[model samples]
Target: KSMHARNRYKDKPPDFAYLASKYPDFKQHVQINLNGRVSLNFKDPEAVRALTCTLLREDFGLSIDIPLERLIPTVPLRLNYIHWVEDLIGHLRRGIDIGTGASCIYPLLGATLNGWYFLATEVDDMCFNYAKKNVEQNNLSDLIKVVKVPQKTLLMDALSEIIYDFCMCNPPFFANQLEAKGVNSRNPRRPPPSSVNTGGITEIMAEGGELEFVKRIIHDSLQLKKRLRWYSCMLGKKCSLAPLKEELRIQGVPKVTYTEFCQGRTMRWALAWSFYDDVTVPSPPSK
Candidate 1:
């Protein structure tokens, strides 16, 4: 097994060691092997539930339990989304994390790092309640608010009462179960095929995977273009980005930009767009 890159743990607290020792039961759930690598166990439902609580307790100092059935986001990518918004908008005052689940990660990170307020939306009762409990446990009800998105819809009528400088999402990446599994099979750390399709539902899966989900945002931007200063989402692949830009040009979004985050061989893309002036938003490429 390859050892974890040496400097990787530089920013991690020493308390992690203590947390590991104190909660032996928890440590096994978050255990690093001989190589110091942490694995995501998609098959073991108990492991998933344990990791949710371990992350909340160890990193964010919150005490709560979540059902194993909910989707658990990896922290590194989740925080990368928050930071990308920070860079794109120049500053993050208030934002919405479109699909905040049991972890409610974006809101927690936004409140801690950027001092930004967050409005997190969820569609499941169990997940919504778990997020609410997390907020209170972290003493962040003031900084982050939780609401149930009745249907698996985007930010229009569902979030009409609030206005934000920007919005962020980690949309479901595949069109259906077969597609989801097909993509997962290519995963370097691919789990059992049966376990892949069982996690998130329609609120997570949009019409044409990442592109269509974001395209819907671009289409809606044409109507309520001025509502948000910036709207962005994390794209899973380069192929998922181009079509969104084409649609943005037709819808007159003025400008769009991509930021690349590389973790070893894994590459993640983040795209940002604004329905504002050329100065604030990048202008569409010459046709």
Candidate 2:
């Protein structure tokens, strides 16, 4: 587990047996061997979602309505992104979740855990409504605000001139449905993915995929500049970082750094860049 040291799961992962014993919703998903070892079925989307919801309720006291058909926000992975932001500008502050999905997880986590303010955006109508439901259900309206943006826009025009301490994203990772289905990233001899493929098209695919999606963010940063102190995002591919970092240098971005979010079998890369010279960018977490 090479995840951030501050991640709750880094030192002690979720106790499946305890969780299964505590929550009947999760108990239905857990499997107990004859010897008494316990585990959940990651292959089933409902099982995956139950685990996610259980962790949310057990850890953060949250109740969010997200369909199994949409992307399920895993707690450990999400915490890694929030922890990286803590490194960026310490704790109490304001930030944005670029494309907050149906769960509105980043904002909920940011607000409930850190007492930080969040401005969350969602382009899809169902997602927008559910994101609102998550925030409102948590009674975090004072801490996190959900906004609806048009499909064609990322930021700007929506946020207008408001300055933010930081912004984070989990961009759609593929250009088309095939790649989104893992066909393009296939290794025939390798094992199948551990978790269910629950991500919807809008939640997982963009016009040109994650690299191109991130480039559009950089373009926005060029215009927004210091209005947003630090711009960051999670990348699906390791190969996407070098070119994106190089592009930042070519555009003369002053401060830039990258970090990894490792949990279970997943490895996610996060990139953060600052236009302000005084801001500090932490060194990557050790391997």
Candidate 3:
């Protein structure tokens, strides 16, 4: 699988040569090949960050800054999640991003590409400040609302009398220090990571990793089932998909679905559940 069928990068990948020639800042990160092509050092965090930033600036007319110490979310992978959400809810009006990191990436892309509004939430002071600045930088303050929230809540604090189209997240994927260090990787033969992994503990680790973090999302969904049309999150591993889906079934969720986000060697899974019958839910692709 490459990516969501609707993802812009699925068929026409990013043209590094075009990017480098057009943007001076991104040019330093690219290598000019003998054949007149261009490529990036995927292993370098700054280079990877440059590609993400340039893509936003080039294709979407948006500019943003992210510290190297924080997670640098890739544009294509994030587009996969955004396209999948549109598949579920074609209206694509308003939503919330739980734990928007230093870049506030998901919300930025969501707002630029689809005109989707967001309530971007973050708990860390540094991440919260940068997320707010990123939004304001692009003049997306009208479309995106950044908030600094307490760690104790996810979707809980965002609930209100007004209904939201959906809530999306890329939850902290690791349980503890070991998993963060790749000690628990499923593929022993897997190659070294391509891009540098950078982020504070909260950006990568939750109390019980992605499973529990998402379970907490489900718990909040159970209470405010109607407050938002759908509750969803991008998970780090395939194994987490089963148990989380099982819990939704056990809780008797009225509507549930899951799908894969594929781009090169990396694969991500997302789970969505809703209590609203009028809203359509995409069918879970074959496992």
* Reference-based lDDT, each prediction: 0.67, 0.86, 0.86
- What order do you get sorting by TM-score, best first? 2, 3, 1
lDDT of 2 by residue, 1-287 (tens): 47787787877889998999899989998887778798877888888889999999998899877887788888999998899898898555889888899899999998988888998988888888889998999899999988987752345465666678999999988888787767764466666688877776777899999889999999888988988899998999898999999989999998999998988888999999998978877997666
Q: Which segments of model 3 are wrong by more than 4 Å?
A: 32-36, 185-190
Cα displacement (angstroms), candidate 3, residue 247, comes to 0.7
lDDT tens digits, residues 1-287, model 1?
11122222225523445556677666676656577655545456665556556765666565665556677555555655666676677763778787787778788878877688888888778779888998898788989988888744454454564557888877777787776656555566764442323355744566788877777766666666666778888888678878877887777667788766544345677788876783265332235
| Candidate 1 lDDT score at position 130 | 84
- Across 1-287, the per-residue lDDT of candidate 3 in tens digits comes to 67888888888988888888899999998886678679888878889989999988888887888888888889889889999988888644889998899998888888887899998888888899889999998999999999888873554555557789888998899998988887665778877776678888888999989999889889988888788888899999999999999999999998999998999788889998889989877887775
Clashes of each: 1, 0, 0
